Design a protein around this nucleic acid. Structure first.
Lengths: 141, 185, 131, 57
RNA sequence: ACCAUGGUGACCACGGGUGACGGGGAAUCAGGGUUCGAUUCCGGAGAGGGAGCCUGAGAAACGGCUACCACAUCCAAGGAAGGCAGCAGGCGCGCAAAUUACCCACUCCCGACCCGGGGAGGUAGUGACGAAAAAUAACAAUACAGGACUCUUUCGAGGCCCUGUAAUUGGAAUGAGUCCACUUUAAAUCCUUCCGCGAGGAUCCAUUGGAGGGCAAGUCUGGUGCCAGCAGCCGCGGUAAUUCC
């Protein structure tokens, strides 16, 4: 049973502030270690240079190779992998360009069947990835 | 710092769930039977019809002869009596709860210029109002959503600078008297 | 001239400023917005002075033509029109000369005098030969 | 092999290119709402078939 | 200075953290609440970091001074001068933010003051942060397809309304644009007003995403064959894919 009497509002309010540390979405937003750990550092997008193309293999029901990179950032530089979210657009990016990696859709969890990628590539070399795919823009000369 | 205004509010409202098929069909046949441009200006007048029904239904949980129910409630009703959506002899705070969306779309300028006979084919009324032909008494207005009152409801007409009330024809009648008189007599 | 009618309203005279001030609305059906000097001679034949003390301004055409409206005023005299009048509307019909430097020069002139003390023979010729 | 890391953009580079031809423009805005208020609502279709949708083939 | 041994604490002291300036407020919206509040209003704090003063009614002032620390300018090498968290601007950091423009005309302020000054503030340029109005066509004569209206009837087609082909036109239709003149303002710009030009693919060209289910819309054709790819989720792909291109 719980408390109910016209004097226990210290007990109930103290019982609530320490039991809120047991769901995740309060704990990762108010403990501080979860944002000193994500590569974005609490932002929405990040530029970083491309180190190495890597092709990861999709989950067991499926069977394909998902095209990925090994971007190392400029803001407090950290090693991440990022997905190139289109059909032919890995062929646009080359060695040590700068790309604007974004979030990938469900808040730092992997979407789809790519095992453990967290980020996707938009805007390689300051031109948009959809613009390259649609023939709007190109690489510099 | 600045003498700027800083104050604005949204006029329309987005629906709570989208893509439900029974809504956007019965809300489609308002877009054509009163002749509108998009569903924002249905969502406009829905939010207008919403907050009146919010205000009126708040006035029913009050006890009778409450001083702000008598003031603000009666000033509400004469505000939608002067605009011609609510007929005057039946003024109650209960008949307003029966008012629907279809009666605000009748009191626009854009369809009080169709039924008055000044235009046909309701989509043509937008081609006449916005294209600067139709006035209210001494003020020509190119606005479809001009909610015309009941007082200045007899005085919708074409204007005096307008072609339909004056002259000095536009660039196509002047061209038609030029296309025969530009290379010969 | 033909159909340009000068109504006015909210008339007020004062011996505080020796002016007669009133709100002008001009009703013109089929013209452009009439000039300021086309109207200020028409108040010369309504309040019976000469069109020298009539200053009209702030004309604002309503949407669709017809009634533009403004504010205008009439002093009692021209020596009253010089004292209690702002210098820009006195220059609407040329009666005051304000053609000075830009204010960027006048500041730098003031900051260049600031670095020279006392020497009145050089407090005025503080970089006025280099033109 | 099973598409290891090469031939990225395989099916895009070898689809044949059919040209995007042209029609009369679609009406925009208010007149576009007129032409589909007419198509769905004012025109009672006398034929049946469990009222098949507007993109049927 | 001389005596007294006190004070606070599980009713959370003390120490730590804060991505902590506080508030009027803002987003949310059944009620209870959740979360934001650097930011024009009130109050506080500080001008690179700490410190010390002068004048003055009011400053421990920094577009005041002295000193150290830190950063940095000129030098003829003896010395000198620095403090944009003011306005513009520059570099740098970054996912991420405007012109080295005009004027005290307005709102106020200061002064010995009806007169001077004010990057306070005002005006414009940038401005798809955001909010409000609102174009990209409308009527026709055929015309082809439907409607309780037509014959004493599923005869025969309609003199009658609505739609869409596909038209041919048109005409007191007009704007975006062009451009005089006013008006507008301190001066201008806009906006409104108004001459004059300005629409038949009005080519004067509306896009961004979707079309298995959630979730509104194709089992249409071609290509690729667990490949390339898609897919927030369930899933779709291995030679006829309603899901890729």
């Amino acid at each position: 049973g719980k408390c109910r009497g016209l004097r226990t509002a210290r007990k109930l309010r103290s019982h609530r502030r320490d039991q809120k540390w047991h769901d995740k979405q309060y704990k990762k937003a108010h403990l501080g270690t979860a944002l000193k750990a994500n590569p974005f550092g609490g932002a929405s997008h990040a530029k970083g240079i491309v180190l190495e193309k890597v092709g990861v293999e999709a989950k067991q029901p499926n069977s394909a190779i998902r095209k990925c990179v090994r971007v190392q950032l400029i803001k407090n530089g950290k090693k991440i992998t990022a997905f190139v979210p289109n059909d032919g657009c890995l062929n646009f990016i080359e060695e040590n360009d700068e790309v604007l990696v974004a979030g990938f859709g469900r808040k730092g969890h992997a979407v789809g069947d790519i095992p453990g990628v967290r980020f996707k590539v938009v805007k390689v070399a300051n031109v948009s990835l959809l613009a390259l795919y649609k023939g709007k823009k190109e690489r510099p000369r | 710092p600045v003498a700027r205004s800083w104050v604005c509010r949204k006029t329309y409202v987005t629906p709570r769930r989208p893509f439900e098929k029974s809504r956007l069909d019965q809300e489609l046949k308002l877009i054509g039977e009163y002749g509108l441009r998009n569903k924002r200006e249905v969502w406009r007048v829905k939010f207008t019809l919403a907050k009146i029904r919010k205000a009126a239904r708040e006035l029913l949980t009050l006890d009778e002869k409450d001083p702000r129910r008598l003031f603000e409630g009666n000033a509400l009703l004469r505000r939608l009596v002067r605009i011609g959506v609510l007929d005057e002899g039946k003024m109650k705070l209960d008949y307003i709860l029966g008012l629907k969306i279809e009666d605000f779309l009748e009191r626009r300028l854009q369809t009080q210029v169709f039924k008055l006979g000044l235009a046909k084919s309701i989509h043509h009324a937008r081609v006449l109002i916005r294209q600067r032909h139709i006035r209210v008494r001494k003020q020509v207005v190119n606005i479809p959503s001009f909610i015309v009152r009941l007082d200045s409801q007899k005085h919708i007409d074409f204007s005096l600078r307008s072609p339909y009330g004056g002259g000095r024809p536009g660039r196509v009648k002047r061209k038609n008297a030029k296309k025969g008189q530009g290379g010969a007599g | 001239n033909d159909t340009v009618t000068i109504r006015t309203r909210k008339f007020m005279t004062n011996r505080l400023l020796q002016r007669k001030q009133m709100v002008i609305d001009v009703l013109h059906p089929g013209k452009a917005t009439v000039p300021k000097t086309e109207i200020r001679e028409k108040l010369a034949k309504m309040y019976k002075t000469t069109p020298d003390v009539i200053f009209v301004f702030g004309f604002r055409t309503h949407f669709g033509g017809g009634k533009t409206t403004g504010f205008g005023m009439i002093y009692d005299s021209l020596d009253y029109a010089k004292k209690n009048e702002p210098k820009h509307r006195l220059a609407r019909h040329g009666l005051y000369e304000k053609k000075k430097t830009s204010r960027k020069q006048r500041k730098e002139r003031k900051n260049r005098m600031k670095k020279v003390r006392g020497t009145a023979k050089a407090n005025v010729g503080a970089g006025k030969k280099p033109k | 092999v099973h598409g290891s890391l090469a031939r990225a953009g395989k099916v895009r580079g070898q689809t044949p290119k059919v040209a995007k031809q042209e029609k009369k423009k679609k009406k925009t805005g208010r007149a576009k709402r007129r032409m589909q208020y007419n198509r769905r609502f004012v025109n009672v279709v006398p034929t049946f078939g469990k009222k098949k949708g507007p993109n049927a083939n």
